[PDB]
């Protein structure tokens, strides 16, 4: 059950890391709830068997996935900074990208 060994070691390292810093906790919970929101919308579509406004469903799902990827990028840059980018720059760039994605998804839903 080498799978179990790797699983337990990963859980150990991850929970230790997220207790050592709170900001990583913020990012991880935000990502988890974004995944929950995506599951909820997929479940709506499946349950009703129709997706009449495809531009609205696409807007919701895409805002969720884009926020997830942006949060993961910020987390990467935070845990181990890049060569020429400080963490204030990695935060301002994230803010700008998030605002642009918000505007695009708001225009997509009509």
């Amino acid at each position: 059950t080498d799978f179990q060994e790797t699983f337990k070691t990963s859980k150990r390292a991850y929970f230790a890391q997220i207790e050592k810093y709170p900001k990583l906790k913020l990012i991880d919970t935000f990502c988890f709830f974004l995944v929950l929101l995506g599951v909820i919308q997929c479940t709506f579509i499946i349950l009703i068997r129709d997706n009449f406004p495809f531009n609205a469903f696409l807007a919701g799902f895409i805002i969720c996935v884009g926020q997830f990827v942006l949060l993961m990028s910020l987390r990467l840059q935070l845990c181990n900074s890049f060569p020429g980018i400080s963490k204030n720059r990695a935060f301002a760039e994230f803010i700008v990208a998030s605002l642009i994605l918000h505007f695009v998804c708001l225009h997509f839903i009509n």
């Binding site: 080498d2 790797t6 070691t9 990963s10 390292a13 495809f54 696409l58 895409i62 996935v65 884009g66 990827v69 942006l70 993961m72 990028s73 990467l76 840059q77 181990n80 890049f82 020429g84 980018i85 990695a90 760039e93 994230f94 700008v96 990208a97 642009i100 994605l101 695009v104 998804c105 225009h107 997509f108």
Partner: protein, 163 residues
């Protein structure tokens, strides 16, 4: 600007001088030729310069500029299908050569997330990115970069032979 990132400024000056008067471009950029290509072929280079700055710096802002100019191009020329199939390939290649790095993840996922949702707003190109064969390459590279990030945290955690 694109050639100053590959080698040096002198090479960029040489390339600008070459492309200023090369006939292969003049054929379609002559005064009076008011077609999509005139603008497009400029936006192509303006987009590849930002994709190379983002891919070799990891910046999210440069990836966002690349996505914005990519959107500017899907809305000007029907040959935008070049970029959407040449930027994934690059990333894809860098994965086979064993050169994956967090900068790659950041750059590509930002570019895709922004540009794909902004390219569906053009009435002409609408819903094609999700249902056409021209853009399935970018989607597959999107998925592959997430399985590779996961495996670059997990395999990096455990020892080599344990893989």
């Amino acid at each position: 600007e694109f050639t100053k990132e590959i080698k040096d400024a002198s090479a960029g000056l040489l390339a600008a001088g070459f492309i200023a008067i090369v006939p292969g471009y003049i054929s379609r950029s002559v005064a009076g030729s008011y077609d999509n290509e005139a603008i497009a072929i400029t936006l192509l280079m303006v987009t590849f310069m930002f994709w190379i700055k983002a891919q070799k710096t990891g910046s999210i802002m440069h990836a966002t500029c690349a996505a914005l100019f990519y959107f500017y191009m899907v809305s000007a020329w029907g040959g935008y299908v070049f970029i959407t199939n040449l930027i994934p390939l690059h990333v894809f290649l860098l994965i086979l050569m064993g050169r994956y790095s967090s900068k790659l993840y950041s750059a590509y996922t930002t570019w895709y997330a922004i540009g794909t949702v902004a390219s569906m707003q053009i009435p002409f190109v609408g819903f094609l990115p999700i249902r056409s064969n021209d853009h399935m390459a970018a989607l597959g590279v999107f998925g592959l970069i997430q399985i590779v990030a996961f495996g670059d945290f997990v395999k990096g955690q455990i020892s080599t032979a344990k893989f």
